[PDB]
Ligand binder design. Structure first.
Ligand SMILES: NC(=O)c1ccc[n+]([C@@H]2O[C@H](COP(=O)([O-])OP(=O)(O)OC[C@H]3O[C@@H](n4cnc5c(N)ncnc54)[C@H](OP(=O)(O)O)[C@@H]3O)[C@@H](O)[C@H]2O)c1
Ligand SMILES: O=C(O)c1c(Cl)c(Cl)c(Cl)c(Cl)c1-c1c2cc(Br)c(=O)c(Br)c-2oc2c(Br)c([O-])c(Br)cc12
Length: 205
């Protein structure tokens, strides 16, 4: 079973709760962070912290070495500009996984990669184009890859009661950040989603 994981994007909205949940669940967690002040003092703490950048192959290599699986929650925070950060990061992650024998990656893009592709809001098209590039990198890697394609990420509580479909239709167009992290972790203990795209959603009201 998976025991050691690396999380990329651990200081982001979804990353922080995925990190806390992973530690609480008993995983030995390594994170790559550019700025360690963005990790919390309170609550569960990662076992290992690598300071560095996902665009630097050597930093990624140090983070992936010795792991059983990788969770990818990279993103651009509020920046909607044209970008290759996520896809170039994914290229480095795949290379490091292959160099170190790691064969399982669970990575977040977005439900826009399941929905009608002519229906992406213009302001999100540039980020979506890089999610598509990252999905291609991961699909073509040959590694066991679970593509997680969430709708709007909300602040609702953790429930563990969301629905996962394979086609982008479901009970709602929202998933709480906590539930999304819980799902990422679920993907570490089953092979049922390997090679598939997944759509987690739930009605919180
Ligand atoms: N917002 C939504 O409703 C929504 C819906 C569906 C999908 N998505 C997608 O879901 C994914 C996760 O979203 P989120 O809101 O949880 O993410 P987020 O808050 O934007 O966090 C991005 C994370 O990636 C890290 N990162 C960015 N560039 C990096 C670099 N060069 N090296 C190392 N780490 C780097 C950030 O580090 P720092 O802390 O150092 O900045 C942060 O940890 C994103 O790809 C997003 O586009 C979002
Ligand atoms: O209308 C939006 O898209 C939007 C707006 Cl208009 C506002 Cl105000 C806010 Cl806060 C957010 Cl989070 C979003 C949003 C999002 C909303 C819905 Br509905 C949805 O189904 C999906 Br998929 C969404 O994907 C996003 C991705 Br990809 C991002 O990287 C960011 Br950044 C924001 C979104």
């Amino acid at each position: 079973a998976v025991k050691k994981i690396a999380i990329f994007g651990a200081t982001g909205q979804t990353g922080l709760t995925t990190l806390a949940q992973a530690v609480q669940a008993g995983y030995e967690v390594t994170v790559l962070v550019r700025d360690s002040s963005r990790l919390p003092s309170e609550g569960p703490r990662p076992a290992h912290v690598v300071v560095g950048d996902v665009l630097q192959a050597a930093d990624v290599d140090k983070t992936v070495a010795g792991q059983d699986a990788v969770i990818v929650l990279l993103g651009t925070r509020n920046d909607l500009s044209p970008t290759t950060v996520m896809s170039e990061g994914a290229r480095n992650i795949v290379a490091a996984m292959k160099a170190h024998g790691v064969d399982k990656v669970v990575a977040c893009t977005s439900a826009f990669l399941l929905w009608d592709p002519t229906k992406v809001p213009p302001r999100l098209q540039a980020v979506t184009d890089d999610h598509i590039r990252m999905h291609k990198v991961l699909r073509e890697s040959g590694l066991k890859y679970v593509a997680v394609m969430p709708p709007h990420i909300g602040d609702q509580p953790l429930t563990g009661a969301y629905t996962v479909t394979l086609d982008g239709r479901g009970p709602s167009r929202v998933i709480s950040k906590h539930d999304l992290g819980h799902f990422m972790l679920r993907c570490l203990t089953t092979d049922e989603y390997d090679g598939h795209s997944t759509y987690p959603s739930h009605q919180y009201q």
